[PDB]
Amino acid sequence: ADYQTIYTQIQARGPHITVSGEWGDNDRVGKPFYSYWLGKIGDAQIGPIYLGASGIAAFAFGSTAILIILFNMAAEVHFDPLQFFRQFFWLGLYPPKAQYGMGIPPLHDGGWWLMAGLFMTLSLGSWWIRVYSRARALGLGTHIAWNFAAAIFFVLCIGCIHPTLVGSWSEGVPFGIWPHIDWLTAFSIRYGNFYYCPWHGFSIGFAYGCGLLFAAHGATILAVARFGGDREIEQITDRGTAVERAALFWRWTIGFNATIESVHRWGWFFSLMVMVSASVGILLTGTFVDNWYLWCVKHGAAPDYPAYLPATPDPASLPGAPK
Amino acid sequence: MYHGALAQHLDIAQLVWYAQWLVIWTVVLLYLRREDRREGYPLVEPLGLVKLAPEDGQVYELPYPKTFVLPHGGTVTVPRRRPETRELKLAQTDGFEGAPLQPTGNPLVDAVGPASYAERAEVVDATVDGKAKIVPLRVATDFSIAEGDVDPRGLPVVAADGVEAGTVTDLWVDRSEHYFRYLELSVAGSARTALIPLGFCDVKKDKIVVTSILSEQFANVPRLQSRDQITLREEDKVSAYYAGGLLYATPERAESLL
Amino acid sequence: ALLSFERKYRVRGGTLIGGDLFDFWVGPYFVGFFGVSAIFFIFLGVSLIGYAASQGPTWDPFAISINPPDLKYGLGAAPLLEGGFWQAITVCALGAFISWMLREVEISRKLGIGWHVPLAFCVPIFMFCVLQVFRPLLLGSWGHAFPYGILSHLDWVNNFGYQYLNWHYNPGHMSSVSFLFVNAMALGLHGGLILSVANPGDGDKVKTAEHENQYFRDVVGYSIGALSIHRLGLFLASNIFLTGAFGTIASGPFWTRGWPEWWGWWLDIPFWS
Amino acid sequence: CFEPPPATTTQTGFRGLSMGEVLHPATVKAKKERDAQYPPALAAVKAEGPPVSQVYKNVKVLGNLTEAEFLRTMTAITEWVSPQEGCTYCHDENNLASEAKYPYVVARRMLEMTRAINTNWTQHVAQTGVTCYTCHRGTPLPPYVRYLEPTLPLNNRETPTHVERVETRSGYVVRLAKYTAYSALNYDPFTMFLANDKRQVRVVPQTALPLVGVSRGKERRPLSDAYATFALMMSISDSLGTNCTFCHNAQTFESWGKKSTPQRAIAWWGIRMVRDLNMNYLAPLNASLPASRLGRQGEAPQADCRTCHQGVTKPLFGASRLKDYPELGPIK
C-alpha cells in the first residue's frame, strides 16, 4: 500500500511562502504557526489571514445577525442561563406566525426575524465579494465566486424571494437548530410532498453525484499519487502518466473518460447544479404549483398501490357528518 | 382560475421541466464531453489511412483549441497532434483487435505497461518565482525534517526480497508545497544514486521497506541528467519504474492472484 | 479505438481469476472474468425486471414498481409475483455490484495504480446492504426493504422516515446530511479552485500551487493542500453513508420511538430538568 | 440511549411502502400490565322492586334502575373514581341525597357525559365504549388532562420539578416540546385544535395549481398553520403510542381512499368527539369546581386523546364493560 495517501510519513518545514496580491498585501495579519498532527493529514501551516474591508463588513453584519438571534433565543427561556444551554437546539427566532402579507411584521412576531435576515444577507454579500475580489487580486478565475453565488441565491430563495412571490413573510426559514429543521416538514407538507417536486429530484441527483464524483475523483488522485497526480495544474498543461492512467482506468471501466481539467468542470458543474435546481424548485413552489403530488398525478407520473387495509372514505364528505 | 395555468392542459412548471432537461443535456453533451476530449484525441485505429480528408465525426467531437500561457514563458495548445514516437517493445498476443500486448524484452527498462512514462517536457518544474521546485536537502538548506518524524538519512533500504539494497542519503522536497516527494539512496555495490518516490516507501524507524521491486532491480532505476534537479519527464521515468515492478518484478505478479 | 497514449498501457496481466482467458478489451471496455460475471448478472437482472414489469399494471417508467413481499413471509422465499421477483432482482444487483467492484481492482492492477477507487466503491455497495439485507435481517422480514421503482422507492423513504415521527432528528441522519452538504461544497471549492488557476482568462498566465494555497489562506486562514483535498474529499463523501448507516440500522432494531424523543438523554438529565 | 431488539412490527400498507407499527415488547408489556388493573365487572344483580325514581329522593340520571342495580352502579363508580376515598367522596354520611359536596354534582354530569359518549360517538368508541375508569384510572383527578397552557408532567400523579412548574417561565419550551413528542414545534395543538372547533386542521391544497383568489398575500393562510397541524399530529401519534403510518400513507397526507387506513377515519371522529366533550361537558365545569382544580385562567381540566388512550392505540387494549353496565350507554 502507498501509505502517503493515508498520512504524511515525514513532514517538511520551511520558510513561509507569500504570493503577492495586486492589493491588500499589508492586510494579511497574524503570524503563521505549524501543527504537527494537522500536518499528518494536511498542510501544517495555519495562518496568516487576509483581513480586507469586506471580510470585516461580513463579520460586522454577521455578528449583528447572530446577536439578534441569540438575544431572542435567551428571551425565550426568560434569560435563565442554565435552561439556555439545556434547551439550545429547541430555541429559535421565528418569522411572523400571523398573516400580515408583505406588511412589515411586529417585532414580537417576526420583526426581529426579518432584521436578522437582512443582516445575514448583508454578511453573505460582503463575504461574496471577498471570495471574488481575492481571486482577482491573486490573478485567478472567478469560478469559486460563481459557485458561491448560486449557494447565496438559493438561501435568498428560501429566505425571502419565495415569501415575496407568494406575498407572506410567514414562509421564511426560522433561525435555530431544530426550528430550521421543522420548517422543512412544514414546507413540504404545505406544498404536497417535496418528493414529487422534480427540481427536488434534480437537486438530489446532483447532490448524490457530488458524492459519487468526489469519492471517485479523490480516490483516483490518491491511486495516482505515486506519479504526482496531485500536482494537477502541471498535469493539465503537460499530461503525465498519472492522468494518462487515471483516464485509462475510467475509460476501461465505463467506456469513456475525462481530462484532468474537465473532471473539475464536471464536479464544479454538479455542485453548481445542486443549488440552481433547488432554486428553480422553490421559485416554482407556491407561485405556480400548490401541491406537488397532485401535479404529478395531473401529469400521470405518480405511482399507485392497491389497498392493504380497506380504502377509507373521507368521513367529512359523508352525508350529515359534523364539521 | 389558476396561477401557472396555460392553454389546454399546459402549465408553467411542465414547460420548465422540459427546459431543464434540455439545459442539462446541452451542457453535458455539447460542452463537457467535448472538454473531455482535449487529450488523447483524435483516436487511433489499425492505421486510419484516409490521409487526404478527415472523417466527419473526428471534427465534430473536438472543441475549439485553447491556449495556456505558461507562467515561466511558453504556451501549450490543446487538443493537438501528439503521437507516441518511441519504439514500444511490445508484441500482439493475438489478431483480435482488443487483445493485450506482451513485453518483448525487459519491461522495466523498456518502459511499457505499468512501467510506461508519459512524454512530458524535459524541463524542471519551477517554483512561483523561478527556482527548481523539487530539490534535495543538500540544496534546500532552509527546509528541515519536522520535529518528531524519522530522519531517513542513514537508514537502510530493504527491497522486496529482504535484501539491503542501499542507504538513504537524502530527501528531495517540493519547495512549492513543503512536501517530501522522493528519497535519494545509494545503491549498494554499484556506486550510483537513485530516487524513490515516497509512495513506494514504508518509512520505519530503523529501515525503509520497499516492496515494489527486488534488490537487484535498483540497478536500472532511470538516471537523472543532473545531480541536484529533476525534469518532469524524469519524474515520470522514475515513478513509472517502480510501478512497473508491481506487475513485473517477479513472474508470479502478472498471473492471477488465485 | 485507442487514445493516442493508450497502446503502451494495454498489456496482459493483473487479473484476479482466469489469467489470459478473459484478459482482453471489447471496444474501450476491459472485460476480465468480472466483466463476464457483471454482464451475466446485469442480463439476468434486467430480464427479471422486464418479466416482472409486464405482469404489472402499467408501462410508464415512473409508475413501475417491483416490491418486496408482505412481512408475513419473514425471511423465506415469496411467490414470484408477490415478492419473489424482488428477491431474485436483489441477488442479481449484488452480483452485478460486487462484480463491478472486482472488475475495477483488475483494471487497477494492470495500470499499476492504487485500488482506492474499488475501495471507495465498497461504501455504496455496503450502504445498499444496510438497507436491503442487514436491516431486514435484524427486523426479521425482507418486507422491510425498499421497492425498485423510480418514484415508488421515494414513497418508501418517505414512510420509513415518518415511522419515527421526524427523521430529521435522527443523529445518524444529522451526521450523514452534514457530510452530504459539506462534500458538495468542497467539490465546488476544489473544482472551482483548480479551474480558477488554469483559466484566469484574458490571456493572463496560468498560476501555480503557491497561488492555490495562497488563495485559501487569504480567505479562510488555512489551505489543506493539493494531495490532502483529495484525501479529504474521499473521506467526506464516504462518511455520508458510513455514518448514516448507523442511523438507518438503529431505526427499528435499536429504537422504536420517535427520533426527537431520543434527545431526552440530554433534555431530561435531572441536574437541569 | 437505545432500546434492545427485537422489535415487533406490523403492516398497514401495501408491501414495499414501509408502513406499519414498530413497537418495543418491554414497553407494550408495561402498558398492558398497567391497563390490566381495570377492575372486573361486578356480579350481575336481578332487577327487583320499583325504579329508584320512586324510592330514593335525588336521582335524576339513573332513575330507570332498580335498587340493587343502582347500588351496583354506585360501587362501580366508587371503584373506578374514588376507590381510596370511598362513598363519602361524593356523599354526606347521613344524607345520601345531599348535593353539598362538589364531586356529587360533577359525577352527575360525568354520568350524562359518559352516557353521551357511548350513544352519540359510537363512530369512535364502537362496541368497546368507555366507563369512568377509562379516564380516571382509580383517582378522582384523571392522570392525563390538559389546561389552556401546557403542563408537566403529563401524568399529574408525578411531582413537578421547579422548571416543570407552569409558573416557571424558563421551562415553557420544554413543557411544550413534551406535548409534541419532543419536537421544537412552537404551537400548542390542544388549545389550537382540541379545546374547540374554531380551527381547521387541514392545510394542504386539493388542486395541483394555486387557485387565483386564495393564493397571494393576506388571502393565504400562514405557513404556521402547517407547523401547527404537524404539531397536533406529532401529539396524536405520541398519545396513542404509534406513528404517522398508522393512519397515513405519507405519499399524500391529504388523501383518503387507498391513501388512508380505517384508523384515520376513526381518529377523525375522535377529534370531533373530544371537541364536543370539552366544549359541552368538561369546560363548563369551572363553575362547579374549587379553585385548586382550575388552571391559571380559571379553566377546568379538559380531555385530549391521551386522557383515554394513555399511549395505546385502543384504550386499555380494547377492554370493555359495555354489556356489563347497560346504564352507561348506549341509551335508546
Ligand code: BCB
Ligand atoms: C435511503 C434512501 C435512498 C434513496 C433516496 C432517494 C431520494 C430522496 C431521491 C432519490 C433519487 C434517485 N434515486 Mg434513489 N436510488 C437509486 C436511483 C435513484 C435515481 C432514480 C434517482 C437519481 C439518482 C442519482 O442521480 O444518483 C447520482 C448518480 C448519478 C448522477 C449517476 C447516474 C445515475 C443514474 C441516473 C441512475 C438511473 C438508474 C436507473 C433509473 C435504474 C436502473 C435501471 C436498470 C433496468 C438498468 C438506485 C439505483 C438505488 C439503489 C440501487 O440503492 C437508490 C436507493 C435510494 N434512493 C435509497 C432507497 N433517491 C431522486 C429521484 O429523482 O428519484 C425519482 C430523488 O429525489
Ligand code: BCB
Ligand atoms: C419531509 C421533508 C423533506 C425535505 C424538505 C426539503 C425542502 C423544503 C427543500 C429541500 C431541498 C433539498 N433536499 Mg430535501 N431531501 C434531500 C436533499 C435535498 C437537497 C439536495 C435539496 C437542496 C438543499 C441543500 O442542499 O441545502 C444545503 C445548502 C444550503 C442551505 C446553502 C447554504 C449556503 C450559505 C451561503 C451558507 C452560509 C451560512 C453562513 C456561513 C452562516 C451564517 C448564519 C448565521 C449568521 C445565522 C434528500 C437526499 C432526501 C431524502 C433521502 O429523503 C430529502 C427529503 C426531504 N426533503 C423530505 C421530502 N428539502 C431544497 C430543494 O431542493 O427544494 C427543491 C429545499 O428547498
Ligand code: BCB
Ligand atoms: C420523510 C423522510 C425523510 C428522510 C428519510 C430517510 C431514510 C429512511 C434514510 C435516509 C437516508 C439519507 N438521507 Mg434522508 N434526507 C437527506 C439526506 C439523506 C442522505 C444523506 C442519507 C443517505 C441516503 C442513502 O442511504 O442512499 C442510498 C444509496 C445507495 C444504496 C446507492 C447504491 C448504489 C449502488 C451500489 C449502484 C447502483 C448502480 C445502478 C443500478 C447502475 C445503473 C447506472 C447506469 C448508468 C448503467 C437530506 C439532505 C434531507 C433534507 C434536506 O431534508 C433528508 C430528509 C429526509 N430523509 C426526510 C426527513 N433518509 C439514509 C440514511 O443514511 O439515514 C441515516 C436512510 O436510510
Ligand SMILES: C/C=C1/c2cc3[nH]c4c(c3C)C(=O)[C@H](C(=O)OC)c4c3nc(cc4[nH]c(cc(n2)[C@@H]1C)c(C(C)=O)c4C)[C@@H](C)[C@@H]3CCC(=O)OC/C=C(/C)CCC[C@H](C)CCC[C@H](C)CCCC(C)C
Ligand atoms: C452545492 C453548493 C454548496 C456550497 C458552496 C459554497 N459554499 C461556500 C463557497 C461555495 C462555492 C465559498 O467560497 C464560501 C467559502 O468561503 O468557503 C471557503 C462558502 C461558505 N460556505 C459556508 C458554509 C456553508 N455552506 C453550505 C452549503 C453549500 N455551500 C452548498 C451545499 C452550508 C450548509 C449545507 O448549510 C454551510 C453552513 C461558509 C464556510 C462560507 C461562507 C462564510 C460567510 O458567508 O460569512 C458569514 C460571517 C460570519 C461572521 C460567520 C462566521 C462563522 C462561519 C462558520 C465562517 C468562519 C470562517 C472563518 C474565516 C474562520 C477563521 C478561522 C481561522 C483563523 C482558522
Ligand SMILES: C/C=C1/c2cc3[nH]c4c(c3C)C(=O)[C@H](C(=O)OC)c4c3nc(cc4[nH]c(cc(n2)[C@@H]1C)c(C(C)=O)c4C)[C@@H](C)[C@@H]3CCC(=O)OC/C=C(\C)CCC[C@H](C)CCC[C@H](C)CCCC(C)C
Ligand atoms: C459515498 C459513496 C458514493 C458513491 C461512490 C461510488 N459510486 C461508484 C464508484 C464510487 C467510488 C464507482 O467506481 C462506480 C463507477 O463506475 O462510476 C462511474 C460507481 C457507480 N455508482 C453508480 C450509481 C450510483 N452511485 C450512487 C451513490 C454513491 N456512490 C454514493 C453517493 C447512487 C445513489 C442512488 O446515490 C447511484 C444510482 C453507477 C453509475 C456506478 C456503478 C455501476 C455498476 O454497478 O455497474 C454494474 C450494474 C449495472 C450496469 C446495472 C445492474 C442492474 C441490476 C442487475 C438490476 C437493477 C436492480 C436495481 C437495484 C434496481 C433499482 C431501481 C431504482 C429505481 C431504485
Ligand SMILES: CC(C)=CCC/C(C)=C/CC/C(C)=C/CC/C(C)=C/CC/C(C)=C/CC/C(C)=C/CC/C(C)=C/CC1=C(C)C(=O)c2ccccc2C1=O
Ligand atoms: C456488451 C458486452 C458483453 C461487453 C463486455 C465488456 C463489459 C463488462 C462491458 C460493460 C458494459 C457496461 C455495463 C457499461 C455501463 C458503464 C457505466 C456503468 C456507465 C455509468 C457512467 C456514469 C453515469 C457515471 C457517473 C459519473 C460521471 C458523471 C462521470 C463523468 C466524468 C467521468 C468520466 C469521470 C471519471 C473520471 C474521474 C472520477 C477522475 O477523477 C479522472 C481523473 C483524471 C482523468 C480522467 C478521470 C475520469 O475519467
Ligand code: HEC
Ligand atoms: C361520585 C363519583 C360518587 C360516589 C363515589 C358514590 N356516589 Fe352515590 N351518587 C352519586 C350521584 C351523582 C348520585 C345522584 C345520581 C343521579 O342519578 O342523579 C348518587 C346517588 C346515590 C344514592 C341515591 C340516594 C338519593 O339521592 O336519594 C345512593 C343510595 C347512593 N348514591 C349510594 C352510594 C354508595 C353506597 C356509594 C359507595 C358504594 C356511593 N353512592 C358512591 C355520586 C357518587
Ligand code: HEC
Ligand atoms: C374522560 C372522557 C372522562 C370520563 C369518561 C369520566 N370522567 Fe370524570 N372527569 C374527567 C375530567 C377531565 C375531569 C376534570 C378533572 C377533575 O378532577 O375535575 C373529571 C372530573 C370528575 C370528578 C370531580 C373530581 C374532583 O375534581 O375532585 C368526578 C367526581 C368525576 N369526574 C366522576 C366521574 C364518573 C363517576 C364518571 C363515570 C360515570 C366519569 N367521571 C367519567 C374525565 C372523565
Ligand code: HEC
Ligand atoms: C391516526 C390516529 C393519525 C395519526 C397517527 C396521524 N394522523 Fe395525520 N391526520 C389524521 C386525521 C384524522 C386527519 C384529518 C383531520 C381532520 O380533522 O380533517 C389528519 C390530517 C393530517 C394532515 C393534513 C392533511 C390535509 O388534508 O390537510 C397532515 C399533514 C397529517 N395529518 C400528517 C401527519 C403526520 C406527519 C403524522 C405522523 C407525525 C400523522 N399525521 C399522524 C390522523 C392521523
Ligand code: HEC
Ligand atoms: C375516551 C372518551 C376517548 C378519547 C378522548 C379518544 N378515544 Fe380513541 N378510542 C376510544 C375507544 C373506547 C376506542 C375503542 C377501541 C376499539 O376496539 O375500537 C377508541 C379507538 C380509537 C382508534 C382505533 C384504533 C384501532 O386500532 O382501530 C383510533 C385511531 C383512535 N381511537 C384515535 C383517537 C384520537 C386521535 C383521539 C384524540 C382526537 C382519540 N382517539 C380520543 C376512546 C377515546
Ligand SMILES: CC(C)=CCC/C(C)=C/C=C/C(C)=C/C=C/C(C)=C/C=C\C=C(C)\C=C\C=C(/C)CC/C=C(/C)CCCC(C)C
Ligand atoms: C425589505 C426588508 C425589510 C426585508 C428583506 C430582508 C431580507 C433580505 C431577509 C432575508 C432573510 C433570509 C435570507 C432568511 C434565511 C434564513 C435561513 C436560511 C435560516 C437557516 C438556518 C439558521 C440556523 C441554522 C441558525 C441557527 C442559529 C444559531 C445556531 C444561533 C446563532 C449562533 C451561531 C454560532 C450560528 C452557527 C450556525 C452553524 C455554523 C452552527
Ligand SMILES: CCCCCCCCCCCC[N+](C)(C)[O-]
Ligand atoms: C422526483 C419527481 C419526478 C417526477 C417526474 C414527473 C414529470 C412530469 C412531467 C411529464 C411530462 C409531461 N407529460 C405530457 C408527459 O405528462
Ligand SMILES: CCCCCCCCCCCC[N+](C)(C)[O-]
Ligand atoms: C438526475 C441528474 C442528472 C445527471 C446527468 C449526468 C449524466 C451523465 C451522462 C454521461 C453520458 C456519457 N456519454 C458518453 C454517453 O456522453
Ligand SMILES: CCCCCCCCCCCC[N+](C)(C)[O-]
Ligand atoms: C433519460 C435519463 C438518463 C439518465 C442518465 C443515464 C446515464 C447514461 C450512461 C449510459 C452511457 C453508457 N455509455 C454508452 C457511455 O457507455
Ligand SMILES: [Fe+3]
Ligand atoms: Fe482534483
